[PDB]
Amino acid sequence: KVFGRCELAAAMKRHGLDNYRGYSLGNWVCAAKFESNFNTQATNRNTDGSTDYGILQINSRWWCNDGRTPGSRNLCNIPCSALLSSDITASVNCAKKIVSDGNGMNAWVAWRNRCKGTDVQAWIRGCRL
Protein backbone atom coordinates (compact mmCIF):
# COMPACT_ATOMS: atom_id res chain seq x y z
CA LYS A 1 0.00 0.00 0.00
CA VAL A 2 1.20 3.48 -0.87
CA PHE A 3 0.06 5.82 1.91
CA GLY A 4 -0.95 9.40 1.53
CA ARG A 5 1.00 11.86 3.66
CA CYS A 6 -1.86 12.68 6.04
CA GLU A 7 -3.16 9.10 6.00
CA LEU A 8 0.22 7.89 7.22
CA ALA A 9 0.51 10.66 9.81
CA ALA A 10 -2.85 9.66 11.29
CA ALA A 11 -1.89 5.98 11.28
CA MET A 12 1.41 6.72 12.99
CA LYS A 13 -0.25 8.95 15.58
CA ARG A 14 -2.76 6.20 16.35
CA HIS A 15 0.14 3.80 16.93
CA GLY A 16 1.89 6.09 19.43
CA LEU A 17 4.73 7.60 17.40
CA ASP A 18 3.90 11.27 18.04
CA ASN A 19 6.65 12.49 20.38
CA TYR A 20 7.83 8.91 20.92
CA ARG A 21 11.24 9.28 22.59
CA GLY A 22 10.84 12.99 21.89
CA TYR A 23 10.46 12.73 18.10
CA SER A 24 7.47 14.69 16.85
CA LEU A 25 5.17 13.12 14.26
CA GLY A 26 6.66 15.12 11.38
CA ASN A 27 10.01 13.39 11.93
CA TRP A 28 8.43 9.99 11.37
CA VAL A 29 6.48 11.06 8.29
CA CYS A 30 9.59 12.71 6.83
CA ALA A 31 11.63 9.55 7.42
CA ALA A 32 8.99 7.37 5.75
CA LYS A 33 8.78 9.70 2.74
CA PHE A 34 12.46 9.49 2.02
CA GLU A 35 13.05 5.90 3.05
CA SER A 36 10.21 4.30 1.10
CA ASN A 37 8.19 7.05 -0.63
CA PHE A 38 5.36 5.93 1.70
CA ASN A 39 5.29 2.46 0.08
CA THR A 40 4.87 -0.41 2.54
CA GLN A 41 6.24 -2.87 -0.05
CA ALA A 42 9.59 -1.12 -0.54
CA THR A 43 12.67 -3.34 -0.37
CA ASN A 44 16.29 -2.43 -0.98
CA ARG A 45 19.36 -4.68 -0.84
CA ASN A 46 22.41 -3.32 0.96
CA THR A 47 26.10 -3.73 0.21
CA ASP A 48 26.45 -5.87 3.27
CA GLY A 49 23.94 -8.48 1.98
CA SER A 50 21.17 -7.41 4.32
CA THR A 51 17.93 -6.00 2.96
CA ASP A 52 15.84 -3.04 4.15
CA TYR A 53 12.10 -3.64 4.40
CA GLY A 54 8.94 -1.63 4.41
CA ILE A 55 7.81 1.89 5.00
CA LEU A 56 10.71 2.61 7.38
CA GLN A 57 13.30 0.43 5.59
CA ILE A 58 14.14 -1.65 8.62
CA ASN A 59 17.29 -3.69 8.08
CA SER A 60 17.60 -7.48 8.28
CA ARG A 61 21.14 -7.30 9.72
CA TRP A 62 19.68 -6.48 13.14
CA TRP A 63 15.93 -6.27 13.30
CA CYS A 64 14.08 -8.97 11.39
CA ASN A 65 14.67 -12.39 9.90
CA ASP A 66 14.60 -12.88 6.14
CA GLY A 67 16.46 -16.20 6.10
CA ARG A 68 19.25 -14.89 3.88
CA THR A 69 21.37 -12.52 6.03
CA PRO A 70 23.85 -14.93 7.66
CA GLY A 71 24.98 -14.07 11.15
CA SER A 72 22.25 -11.45 11.52
CA ARG A 73 20.04 -10.79 14.51
CA ASN A 74 16.27 -10.59 14.68
CA LEU A 75 15.85 -8.08 17.48
CA CYS A 76 12.19 -7.31 16.65
CA ASN A 77 11.40 -11.07 16.59
CA ILE A 78 9.52 -10.88 13.28
CA PRO A 79 9.92 -12.12 9.75
CA CYS A 80 10.99 -9.22 7.56
CA SER A 81 7.97 -9.87 5.33
CA ALA A 82 5.75 -8.71 8.22
CA LEU A 83 7.24 -5.25 7.61
CA LEU A 84 5.70 -5.10 4.12
CA SER A 85 2.08 -5.35 5.30
CA SER A 86 -0.49 -2.67 4.54
CA ASP A 87 -0.97 -2.70 8.33
CA ILE A 88 1.96 -0.69 9.69
CA THR A 89 1.72 -2.09 13.23
CA ALA A 90 4.76 -4.37 12.91
CA SER A 91 6.89 -1.63 11.36
CA VAL A 92 5.91 0.86 14.07
CA ASN A 93 6.49 -1.58 16.93
CA CYS A 94 9.91 -2.44 15.53
CA ALA A 95 10.74 1.23 14.88
CA LYS A 96 10.02 1.93 18.56
CA LYS A 97 12.72 -0.59 19.51
CA ILE A 98 15.19 0.88 17.03
CA VAL A 99 14.70 4.49 18.12
CA SER A 100 15.14 3.43 21.76
CA ASP A 101 18.52 1.72 21.26
CA GLY A 102 20.72 4.76 21.87
CA ASN A 103 21.13 6.58 18.55
CA GLY A 104 17.58 7.87 18.21
CA MET A 105 16.42 8.43 14.67
CA ASN A 106 20.02 8.69 13.44
CA ALA A 107 19.48 4.96 12.77
CA TRP A 108 17.67 6.10 9.58
CA VAL A 109 20.23 7.54 7.17
CA ALA A 110 17.55 9.37 5.19
CA TRP A 111 16.24 11.00 8.35
CA ARG A 112 19.72 12.20 9.29
CA ASN A 113 20.43 13.51 5.80
CA ARG A 114 17.05 14.90 4.73
CA CYS A 115 14.88 15.49 7.81
CA LYS A 116 17.13 16.29 10.77
CA GLY A 117 17.33 20.03 11.27
CA THR A 118 14.59 20.83 8.77
CA ASP A 119 11.04 22.09 9.30
CA VAL A 120 9.63 18.61 9.81
CA GLN A 121 6.26 19.93 11.00
CA ALA A 122 5.64 20.74 7.31
CA TRP A 123 5.10 17.01 6.76
CA ILE A 124 1.94 17.04 8.90
CA ARG A 125 0.61 20.51 8.10
CA GLY A 126 -2.85 20.55 6.61
CA CYS A 127 -3.75 17.14 8.10
CA ARG A 128 -6.75 16.64 10.38
CA LEU A 129 -4.95 14.92 13.29
From Swiss-Prot:
It catalyses: Hydrolysis of (1->4)-beta-linkages between N-acetylmuramic acid and N-acetyl-D-glucosamine residues in a peptidoglycan and between N-acetyl-D-glucosamine residues in chitodextrins. It comes from the Eukaryota. Gene3D superfamilies: 1.10.530.10. InterPro entries: Glyco_hydro_22, Glyco_hydro_22_CS, Glyco_hydro_22_lys, Lysozyme-like_dom_sf. Its EC number is 3.2.1.17. Disulfide bonds join 6-127, 30-115, 64-80, 76-94. Coiled coil: none annotated. GO terms for biological process: cell wall macromolecule catabolic process; defense response to bacterium; defense response to Gram-negative bacterium; defense response to Gram-positive bacterium; killing of cells of another organism. Keywords: Allergen, Antimicrobial, Bacteriolytic enzyme, Disulfide bond, Glycosidase, Hydrolase, Secreted, Signal. Residues 1-129 form the C-type lysozyme domain. The active site is at residues 35, 52. GO terms for molecular function: beta-N-acetylglucosaminidase activity; identical protein binding; lysozyme activity. In the egg white and polymorphonuclear leukocytes. GO terms for cellular component: cytoplasm; endoplasmic reticulum; extracellular space. Lysozyme C is capable of both hydrolysis and transglycosylation; it also shows a slight esterase activity. It acts rapidly on both peptide-substituted and unsubstituted peptidoglycan, and slowly on chitin oligosaccharides. Monomer. Lysozymes have primarily a bacteriolytic function; those in tissues and body fluids are associated with the monocyte-macrophage system and enhance the activity of immunoagents. Has bacteriolytic activity against M.luteus. This is Lysozyme C. It comes from Gallus gallus (Chicken). The gene is LYZ.
